[PDB]
Amino acid sequence: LRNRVTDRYFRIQEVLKHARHFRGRKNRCYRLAVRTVIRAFVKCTKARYLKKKNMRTLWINRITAASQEHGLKYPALIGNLVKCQVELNRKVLADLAIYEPKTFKSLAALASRRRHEGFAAALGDGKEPEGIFSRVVQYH
């Protein structure tokens, strides 16, 4: 036994510390803990995509609720805000819906105003002047 390992306790603990909150023997036995800890870390790594995906889904659901409270639909709200050049993102829109109901109602009013201004343009295309809120600010 010229060279024998002496750190195996700490090598085991490096994994068992992460395994301590599991169920069953996976939190005690290293043979079982290591397999589940590797899976836990892989899931943690892959969950950074799902966190972003679900946040946008949550924001979209909340914005849909807020817009339906005003009779609008989420596609109409988003498209017409973009057409009005309001670049508020979905996170901020959901935050406004939850915490600034009056501002969100104002924004929904702007979107519906644009959506009706859009329709008037489509009906009488050409001669009709651009709607007041349909005018686009140009940057150069």
């Binding site: 949550l58 659901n61 909340r62 914005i63 849909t64 609720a65 339906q68 409270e69 959901a94 939850i98």
Partner: peptide, 8 residues
């Protein structure tokens, strides 16, 4: 509760 902006 999907009609509430505070939905989760």
């Amino acid at each position: 509760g999907l009609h509430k902006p505070v939905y989760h």
